DNA sequence: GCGCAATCAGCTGTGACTACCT
DNA sequence: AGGTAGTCACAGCTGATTGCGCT
């Protein structure tokens, strides 16, 4: 209905609103008001997109001028299509209520391989690819040579739109990246060459992290679009880890192989300017010297580039004309496809950063590998340390950049982890007519021993019979499916091994069905839909998996889909790979971060993040259940995000496996009765 | 600029100013003996402050954190500056007066306490 | 070495028992 | 010849000390 804020109206497409929203509506009010950044923190999955949507189109319908871009990017493809459908739900809501339509342009992007109408391109499964080739099918030479029409098989969409879509705009209607696709196939004209010319003339639009916080892309993206813009980075509760992700590479034998190969080729081609021809011939053994050195570690980001010009004698000015070169150089070249070539882009952008980029960066050589540590492995990371370089380009070019997601609890570490000045410091609790979830902390069981995860204890035979039994006892209370997260796969290993070997894994079996995930994407797949379909009828299952895995993430538990999510031991990070220590002592020695509280903040937010994945819907309901003692202790409990805390309750912090029980199953009976709206 | 204390000489930044905002350049920090790093611990006991007394009353006292020799997993030591500390206790207890007699009279109670529980 | 939880000192409420002046 | 401040028991609270835990 109509929210009639202290001055302005805004139309939601639901006519009851839960308070919860309310305040986030007039706190997101306030902070635009504030013309300045902030980070949000909200329960729901579900019913925030609608309202920031719906405070969004209120605030541009009241200040045209004060906003004229917004920006939605999402961690994937299924939350950009679910944020386009709520949307559209609610443009349909504002034509229905008001009876003309307005001239708002949404669209959403993505990757080439998503956006393309090519039946050749389409069925192959290479994304480094697919670029490629579309830049061979269609660039400025081939619009060169279009001229005297050229019979060679090349694409011929953006050779209409160029001289149809240039012309006629797209002043209304939202359009998903399936309306874009059809609206190309139908016109004539390429989806991303039409979003690429209307994101110009639009109200809104929606991408992926990767768009804004690669800096190769995101000045392209977005240069001058809109010096007052507002960008949202929904569910980015590990955003400072992409961050990394953007500053981090990684080089292998294979690699330098490729480069190696390729490089007689590009010569080749060649003899049928040389400024680089001859510069990037004694690039490749300067790197391939480590590859003989037999050492641990070496660490000198700024005496790096020293070895460099030591060794070979060049400058350090010449490397930061390599990226120019790419688009300089290559496109004389012709290159057919992009294929057997990115190992030399990856390259030289790697030298292009460690001549700018080294003041908050390490390099690091490490000789392991998995079950090889030292045979011929040395890996070469130029790992980032600092989340401020991938966040200061967004936060100098927007106005009010907001970090929310589901489990952001403290408020204080964000603002100093990265450059970021706060004005909100606000945190919700979602409430319905009854209590949703019942967490709880497990502590010693019944031999009143600590069930803690401890590494001198992750061997000892108590701890594990005491899981063994929780796990048992606790499957008989809770029905269709309890998920449990381990610290780590050798862990969860070694603990089904032992239970395997004792008489007590039997037990289990005959009550819910056993599921282990591994590495394999397409195991991890079909032993989800096997859970999937043992949940759906009264068979029952469980889901054993890590924390620090790509199912932790990748699914969200629905209704009647896990009932019990159970955390055996506080997931902590492995602190070997030399790669944890280097961000603790530069967090250390910058930031002035503990380097406890840090690894306390990482192994709760991993906790939250995978369990509260439980609870998604007002009707849904779920429990939680925390098998380490180490939970009980206030440092960490403080790490929970604030719309847990209140429900966990002071009783129930290191009671043991049976009162757990009795509570679980209290829980259960009293949440299965009907209820209101 | 900033005018150093010591020296008078304009400079940007300095060391002092970064961590403590202390008007002194790196030339005349002498960071041995005038601009000592103690132990949060240890200044709590000999200065008897406590946290509000180091966190919140103003200004806020600020501090360095170090790994620790005896073990890099444990408790990074919190470093504060001496003389900030010293400011403090004289701002909160007056000065070098009677607070003297009064952690006299404190160690007393505790062996009036220790002689009661026997 | 630091941080969280266990412990005691001091004061108070509630109800009842007891030793000197109109 | 007839009545209330100390005193005792058993609880509460808050204000410090004070030994215990460490991927
Ligand atoms: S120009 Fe567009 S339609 Fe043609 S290959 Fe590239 S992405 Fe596909
Ligand atoms: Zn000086």
């Known amino acids: ?677 | 600029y900033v005018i150093c204390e010591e020296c008078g000489k304009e400079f940007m930044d300095s060391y002092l100013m970064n961590h403590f905002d202390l008007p002194t350049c790196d030339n005349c920090r002498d960071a041995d003996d005038k601009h000592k790093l103690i132990t949060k611990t240890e200044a709590k006991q000999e200065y008897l402050l406590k946290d509000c007394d180091l966190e919140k009353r103003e200004p806020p006292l600020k501090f360095i954190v170090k790994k620790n020799p005896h073990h890099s997993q444990w408790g990074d030591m919190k470093l504060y500056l001496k003389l900030q500390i010293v400011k403090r206790s004289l701002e909160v207890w007056g000065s070098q007066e009677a607070l003297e007699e009064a952690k006299e009279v404190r160690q007393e109670n505790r062996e009036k306490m220790k002689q009661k529980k026997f």
Request: aromatic share 10%; proline share 4%.
């Open chain 1, 1 to 677: 209905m109509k929210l009639n804020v202290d001055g302005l109206l805004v139309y939601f497409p639901y006519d009851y609103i839960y308070p919860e929203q309310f305040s986030y509506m007039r706190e997101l009010k306030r902070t635009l008001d504030a013309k300045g950044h902030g980070v949000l923190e909200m329960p729901s999955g579900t019913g925030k997109t609608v309202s920031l949507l719906a405070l969004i189109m209120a605030y541009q319908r009241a200040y045209p001028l004060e906003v004229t871009k917004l920006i939605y990017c999402s961690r994937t493809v299924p939350e950009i299509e679910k944020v386009i459908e709520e949307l559209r739900k609610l443009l349909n809501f504002y034509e229905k209520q008001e009876g003309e339509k307005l001239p708002f342009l949404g669209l959403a992007l993505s990757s080439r391989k998503n956006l393309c109408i090519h039946p050749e391109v389409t069925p192959l499964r290479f994304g480094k690819d697919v670029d490629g080739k579309c830049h061979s099918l269609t660039a400025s030479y081939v619009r060169a040579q279009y001229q005297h029409d050229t019979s060679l098989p090349h694409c011929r969409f953006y050779e209409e739109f160029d001289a149809h879509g240039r012309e006629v705009p797209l002043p209304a209607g939202i359009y998903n990246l399936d309306d874009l696709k059809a609206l190309g196939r139908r016109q004539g004209w390429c989806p991303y060459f039409l979003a690429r010319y209307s994101i110009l003339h639009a109200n809104v639009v929606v991408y992926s992290y990767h768009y804004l916080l690669d800096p190769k892309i995101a000045d392209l993206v977005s240069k001058e679009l809109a010096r007052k813009a507002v960008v949202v980075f929904d569910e980015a509760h590990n955003i400072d880890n992409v961050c990394i992700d953007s500053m981090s590479v990684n080089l292998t034998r294979r690699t330098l192989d490729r480069c190696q190969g390729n490089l007689e080729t590009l010569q080749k081609t060649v003899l049928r300017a040389e400024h680089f021809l001859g510069f990037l011939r004694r690039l490749l053994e300067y790197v391939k010297w480590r590859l003989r050195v037999q050492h641990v570690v070496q660490e000198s980001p700024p005496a790096f580039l020293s070895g460099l010009a030591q060794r070979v004698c060049i400058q350090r000015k010449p490397l930061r004309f390599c990226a120019e070169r790419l688009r300089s150089l290559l496109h004389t070249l012709e290159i057919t496809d992009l294929a057997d070539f990115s190992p030399l882009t990856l390259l030289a952008n790697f030298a292009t950063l460690v001549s700018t980029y080294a003041k908050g960066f390490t390099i690091i050589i490490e000789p392991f590998d998995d079950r090889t540590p030292t045979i011929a492995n040395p890996i070469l990371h130029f790992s980032c340390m600092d989340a401020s370089l991938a966040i200061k380009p967004v936060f100098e070019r927007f106005q009010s950049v907001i970090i929310t997601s589901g489990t952001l609890s403290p408020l204080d570490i964000y603002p100093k982890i990265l450059d970021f000045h706060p004005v909100t410091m606000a945190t919700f609790t979602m409430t319905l007519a009854r209590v949703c979830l019942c967490p709880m902390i497990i502590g010693r069981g019944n031999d009143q021993v600590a069930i803690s995860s401890k590494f001198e204890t992750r061997e000892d035979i108590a701890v594990i019979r005491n899981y063994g039994n929780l796990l048992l006892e606790m499957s008989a209370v809770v029905p269709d499916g309890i998920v449990a997260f381990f610290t780590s796969y050798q862990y969860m290993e070694s603990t089904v091994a032992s239970w395997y070997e004792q008489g007590i894994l039997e037990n289990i079996q005959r009550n819910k069905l056993l599921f282990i995930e591994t590495q394999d994407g397409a195991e991890t797949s079909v032993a989800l839909e096997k859970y999937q379909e043992a949940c759906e009828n009264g068979r029952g299952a469980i889901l054993l998996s890590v924390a620090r895995g790509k199912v932790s993430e990748g699914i969200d538990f629905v209704h009647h889909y896990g009932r019990a999510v159970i955390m055996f031991g506080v997931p902590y990070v492995y602190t070997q790979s030399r790669i944890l220590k280097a961000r603790l002592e530069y967090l250390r020695d910058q930031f002035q971060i503990r380097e406890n509280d840090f690894l306390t903040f990482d192994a709760m937010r991993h906790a939250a993040q995978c369990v509260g994945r439980a609870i998604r819907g007002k009707t849904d309901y779920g429990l939680m259940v925390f098998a380490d003692k180490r939970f009980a202790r206030g440092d960490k409990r403080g790490k929970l995000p604030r719309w847990i805390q209140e429900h966990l309750t002071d009783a129930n912090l290191n009671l043991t496996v049976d009162e757990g029980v009795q509570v679980a199953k209290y829980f259960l009976r009293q949440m299965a009765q009907p209820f209101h709206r």
